[PDB]
Design a protein around this ligand. Structure first.
Ligand code: 8IR
Ligand code: ZN
Length: 208
């Protein structure tokens, strides 16, 4: 029961998501190893993901989380990148597919920087790159990110094995560093604690 609502470029909702996409790009200090070399995206399409069951699941959990955290959900709009985007918009996030060796264990990973989530689109460390060219900096193939509604509740701050949130907490927040560049990473351990609200189709742009 997922319906995709194709948003017009003149729509403020489209523009808002587009600006969040572009403004949160950072210069990773890994030469573009994982996600490619770029300053900007070519934004092709933004679709609103409408699924009534997934949404009700999300808000049911958000209530429970809110009650356990002094009537605060600590809800954020965050990026997700992975190879499972098309499954996710249909069936929701699912922590049973999470990877056990993740830095913060077996959860579902989000970012406030679009360009960090772009590093996971093709797998962890960007896997083997795009399917067609095996190129992690591919400028041709179109990528997809989710801009999602995420319930963090009481988030546990963790350094850079773990299966669930620590006792009394509903999420983990990390700030891992790659070369003096530390960026935020948010991790939930329940699929219902995020709703994949917008599907963004895009390319990374070749700089001049
Ligand atoms: C068939 O139905 C399905 C519906 C939803 C999912 C789903 O939520 N997949 C998913 C769950 C967690 C992540 C996730 O955060 N990560 C995974 C996990 C496994 N493989 C690659 N990345 C992850 C782990 C560490 C760092 C970054 C990421 Cl994106 C990425 C994708 C999977 C299947
Ligand atoms: Zn390619």
């Amino acid at each position: 029961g997922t319906i995709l609502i194709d948003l017009s470029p003149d729509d403020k909702e489209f523009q808002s998501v587009e600006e969040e996409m572009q403004s949160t790009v950072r210069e990773h200090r890994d030469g573009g190893h994982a996600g490619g070399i770029f300053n900007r995206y070519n934004i092709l399409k933004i679709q609103k993901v409408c699924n009534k069951k997934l949404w009700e699941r999300y808000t049911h959990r958000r209530k429970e989380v809110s009650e356990e955290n002094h009537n605060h959900a600590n809800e954020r709009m965050l990026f997700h990148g992975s190879p499972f985007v098309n499954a996710i918009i249909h069936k929701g996030f699912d922590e049973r597919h999470a990877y056990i060796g993740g830095m913060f264990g077996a959860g579902i990973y989000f970012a406030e920087n679009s360009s960090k989530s772009n590093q996971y689109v093709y797998g962890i460390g960007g896997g083997t790159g795009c399917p067609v060219h095996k190129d992690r900096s591919c400028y041709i193939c179109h990528r997809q990110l989710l801009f999602c509604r995420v319930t963090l509740g009481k988030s546990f701050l963790q350094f850079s094995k773990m299966a669930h949130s620590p006792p009394g907490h509903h999420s983990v927040t990390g700030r891992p560093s790659v070369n003096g560049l530390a960026l935020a990473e948010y991790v939930i351990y329940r699929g219902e604690q995020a709703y994949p609200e917008y599907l963004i189709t895009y390319q990374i742009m070749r700089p001049e």
